[PDB]
Structures are given as structure tokens and as C-alpha cells.
Amino acid sequence: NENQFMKEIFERKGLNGTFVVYDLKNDKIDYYNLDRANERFYPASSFKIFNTLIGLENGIVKNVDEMFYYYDGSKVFLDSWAKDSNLRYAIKVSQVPAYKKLARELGKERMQEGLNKLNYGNKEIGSEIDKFWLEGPLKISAMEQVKLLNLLSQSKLPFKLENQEQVKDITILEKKDDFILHGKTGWATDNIVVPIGWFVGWIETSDNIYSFAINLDISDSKFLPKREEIVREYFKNINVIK
Ligand SMILES: [Cl-]
Numbered sequence: 001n002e003n004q005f006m007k008e009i010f011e012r013k014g015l016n017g018t019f020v021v022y023d024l025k026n027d028k029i030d031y032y033n034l035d036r037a038n039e040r041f042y043p044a045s046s047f048k049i050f051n052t053l054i055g056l057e058n059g060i061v062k063n064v065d066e067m068f069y070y071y072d073g074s075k076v077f078l079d080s081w082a083k084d085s086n087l088r089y090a091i092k093v094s095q096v097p098a099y100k101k102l103a104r105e106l107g108k109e110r111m112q113e114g115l116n117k118l119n120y121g122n123k124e125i126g127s128e129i130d131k132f133w134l135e136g137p138l139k140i141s142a143m144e145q146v147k148l149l150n151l152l153s154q155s156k157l158p159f160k161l162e163n164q165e166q167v168k169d170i171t172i173l174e175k176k177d178d179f180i181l182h183g184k185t186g187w188a189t190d191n192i193v194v195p196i197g198w199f200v201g202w203i204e205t206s207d208n209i210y211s212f213a214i215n216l217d218i219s220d221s222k223f224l225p226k227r228e229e230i231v232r233e234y235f236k237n238i239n240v241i242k
């Protein structure tokens with residue numbers, strides 16, 4: 001059964017996409033568009049969550065607070081990227097050049113081993129070590145993202161506990177008394193006719209964890225706010241955001 005509230009919001013907004021929420025305490029899923037929930041898409045910058053985990057596991061940086069990317073005056077799409085950074089800052093601003101540097105330093109072999117340890121989507125790297133998550137060939141489904149995030153949120157992935165902790169800490173979006181929202185946005189625009197907007201993450205409350213993924217057809221940057229709007233509207237409906 002599709003979640004009826006999710007169905008209504010998608011229909012109201014007139015958007016094509018999918019949304020999955022896993023409720024840990026109740027071991028159950030709530031979804032809109034099951035077939036698309038299982039369809040694999042380029043993860044775009046939602047892959048930064050896991051790129052960071054694999055980088056930490058390999059010791060590419062000591063931790064997410066160690067300076068790592070050194071800016072050189074080169075062209076950057078967002079002005080927030082035109083500065084030296086650590087990974088913590090880099091994920092928060094989605095600083096692609098810092099994560100391309102990470103990918104390259106990891107190299108194909110170590111990156112592949114990371115994807116394979118995670119069983120991440122189709123696990124395809126192709127022959128573009130700093131593009132594979134943004135233009136193909138890597139693809140992952142909303143359902144697959146949720147499974148991974150459910151594990152990450154409980155430090156249950158096969159990675160060092162302190163590295164999982166770091167990735168949780170850098171992904172904090174809104175901490176309130178009654179919930180803490182972690183997540184990452186992405187937008188797949190390359191090598192695709194209809195771009196795909198992602199927002200993935202989880203919400204921990206005093207006694208539950210809700211892991212989630214939405215993706216939507218988004219052709220104009222003006223509609224990118226809708227990814228997080230729809231997610232917050234659902235979590236307000238169920239009194240998690242409160
Ligand atoms: Cl920015």
C-alpha cells in the first residue's frame with residue numbers, strides 16, 4: 001500500500017518521483033511509487049556521505065576536521081567552494097572539487113573495495129575515477145539508500161565506529177530537543193535527459209530512527225527546495241518534526 005499522505009503531497013505538487021521512509025522501531029517501510037523506489041539512478045552528491053566513509057577508512061585524512069582541499073583560484077560553480085577546506089565543510093557545501101580530489105587519492109582499487117564492502121548500488125566505477133557518481137555508471141535506488149542509511153545511523157556498517165560517527169556528525173542538518181535530522185542533497189544533471197534531485201538521510205528521536213530517501217524529476221534549480229520540503233512535510237504529518 002502506498003502511504004496515502006505521501007501520495008497526496010506528490011499529486012498536489014504535481015511531481016514525479018519516489019519516497020521511502022524506514023521506521024526502525026516498527027520495522028516497516030512507508031513509500032510512494034514502489035517501482036521507482038527500486039529503480040537505480042546516479043546518486044550525484046548524495047554519494048558524498050559514503051565517499052567520506054571510505055576516505056576515512058583508508059586514512060586519506062586523519063579525520064573530517066583535518067585540512068585536505070587546497071583552493072588554487074580555479075573556476076568553481078559556487079562561491080562557497082572557493083576556499084581551502086576540510087571534509088566537514090566540504091560535505092556541508094557539496095564542494096565537488098574536494099570530493100574529486102578524495103576520489104582520485106583513493107584510486108580505483110580502493111574505491112571499488114569500498115563500494116563492494118558497502119554493496120553500494122550497482123558498484124560500477126567505469127573509467128572516470130572522479131565522475132562515476134555524477135554521470136554514470138554508478139547507480140543506486142531510493143530503497144538501497146535507505147537500507148544503507150538505516151545501518152549507518154546505528155554504526156552497523158563494516159567500518160570503524162569512529163569513522164561512522166564522523167560521518168553522522170558532519171551530516172547534521174537540524175538538531176532539536178525531540179529529533180535530529182541528518183542528510184545530504186544531490187542533483188544528477190549530467191548524462192541524463194531528465195535530471196534527478198535527491199535528498200537522503202535519517203531522523204533520530206528519543207526512541208526511533210527514520211531513514212529516508214526521496215528522488216524527483218527536477219529540471220530547473222528553482223524546484224530543488226522541493227526535495228527537503230516534501231520530506232519535512234511528511235515528518236511534520238507524523239509529528240516527528242515538532
Ligand atoms: Cl553555497
Ligand SMILES: [Mg+2]
Binds near residue numbers: 068
Ligand atoms: Mg592530509
Ligand SMILES: [Mg+2]
Binds near residue numbers: 153154
Ligand atoms: Mg545509536
